[PDB]
Amino acid sequence: QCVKLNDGHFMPVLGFGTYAPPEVPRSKALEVTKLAIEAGFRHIDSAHLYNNEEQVGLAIRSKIADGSVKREDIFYTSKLWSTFHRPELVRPALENSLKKAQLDYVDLYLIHSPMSLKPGEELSPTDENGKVIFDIVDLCTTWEAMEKCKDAGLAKSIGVSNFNRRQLEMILNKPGLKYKPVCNQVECHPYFNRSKLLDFCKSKDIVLVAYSALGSQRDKRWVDPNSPVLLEDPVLCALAKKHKRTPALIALRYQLQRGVVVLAKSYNEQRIRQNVQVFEFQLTAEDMKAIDGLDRNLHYFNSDSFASHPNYPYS
Ligand SMILES: NC(=O)c1ccc[n+]([C@@H]2O[C@H](COP(=O)([O-])OP(=O)(O)OC[C@H]3O[C@@H](n4cnc5c(N)ncnc54)[C@H](OP(=O)(O)O)[C@@H]3O)[C@@H](O)[C@H]2O)c1
Ligand SMILES: CCOc1ccc2c(c1)C[C@@H](C(=O)N(Cc1cc(C(=O)O)c(C)o1)Cc1cc(C(=O)O)c(C)o1)CO2
Numbered sequence: 001q002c003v004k005l006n007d008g009h010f011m012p013v014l015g016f017g018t019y020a021p022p023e024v025p026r027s028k029a030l031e032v033t034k035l036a037i038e039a040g041f042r043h044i045d046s047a048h049l050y051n052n053e054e055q056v057g058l059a060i061r062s063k064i065a066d067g068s069v070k071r072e073d074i075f076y077t078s079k080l081w082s083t084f085h086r087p088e089l090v091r092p093a094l095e096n097s098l099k100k101a102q103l104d105y106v107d108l109y110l111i112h113s114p115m116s117l118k119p120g121e122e123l124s125p126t127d128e129n130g131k132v133i134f135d136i137v138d139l140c141t142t143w144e145a146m147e148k149c150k151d152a153g154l155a156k157s158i159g160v161s162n163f164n165r166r167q168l169e170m171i172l173n174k175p176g177l178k179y180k181p182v183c184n185q186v187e188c189h190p191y192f193n194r195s196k197l198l199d200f201c202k203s204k205d206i207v208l209v210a211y212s213a214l215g216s217q218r219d220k221r222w223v224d225p226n227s228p229v230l231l232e233d234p235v236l237c238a239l240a241k242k243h244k245r246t247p248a249l250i251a252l253r254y255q256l257q258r259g260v261v262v263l264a265k266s267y268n269e270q271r272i273r274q275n276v277q278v279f280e281f282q283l284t285a286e287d288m289k290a291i292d293g294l295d296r297n298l299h300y301f302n303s304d305s306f307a308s309h310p311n312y313p314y315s
Pocket of ligand 2: 019301314
């Protein structure tokens, strides 16, 4: 199934997450994106940050060439990295992502994060103290540049990521706004279910897209190792045993039933294929309330550096 976006385009409600940490060779992104398409994924989530748009694009082209899909069957998302928020940098960044992926357009272009960073070639510009260097940019002007990308046909839809309510409001209340964001891609799972943000987005016809919906990759660079492991949650495990599914499938289906579009990363062929079985079963209303009770305001991504950013969304 798809959801209709507020610009009239459609987005598949299950997306494939493509990030893998730099210790994973890029050949793997090419391989698993092909497997995801083979399994039935049609929404593919990538980004300049991920250093994989070339491989993801090669996988899409290879599946088009063997007649598995057509380009119009694939919903490809890329994201503007935070060193490219200054408005004159936005369209060149998108064109660069398109050249690397060898695509004519993206289905969805997002502002990856509101936390602007010093412009330059470094993804993570850092000073002599090791501190990543922030930049100050009016994100309304970034948004104006995103809108020009949509008008040029390089992005079919535009949206944001990691925005809070106040940041969304800043865009929605912008004078002369042309296009609302179609979505806000945010961390969302049973330990951080974003019910308030979800209700706000629903009222504005903005789709919430959940990342780390399976509890994140627990990268030691971003995730406290003492944080509870989502997929070992005793409630999720009990519902998995009742439904003869897995905890991951319960976590994904939870999002689908509350009107959230859900991403799932896996670089494992069998788990990739497993995740598409989220469409095969339903949670009861009692099950959904049980999962609603798991919320702990737990954001897996927690960097203290970034907690000092003026646009940090969890302040
Ligand atoms: N906008 C942003 O700032 C942002 C931030 C984070 C993520 N994202 C996007 O969201 C994608 C998903 O989020 P994420 O990377 O944090 O990971 P995730 O989807 O929460 O998955 C976490 C881990 O779950 C495991 N997994 C997948 N299916 C499983 C299954 N059926 N059973 C058991 N374990 C399973 C995967 O390991 P295996 O690979 O070993 O299967 C994966 O490493 C990301 O790849 C990215 O595209 C965006
Ligand atoms: C690893 C590359 O090196 C860098 C270097 C600088 C840098 C980032 C990554 C990412 C930025 C960012 O915004 N994230 C982190 C993120 C997103 C994804 C993805 O898969 O999309 C991954 C792998 O990491 C989201 C976020 C974190 C927090 C927090 O609280 O820490 C909040 C509120 O949002 C910050 O700047």
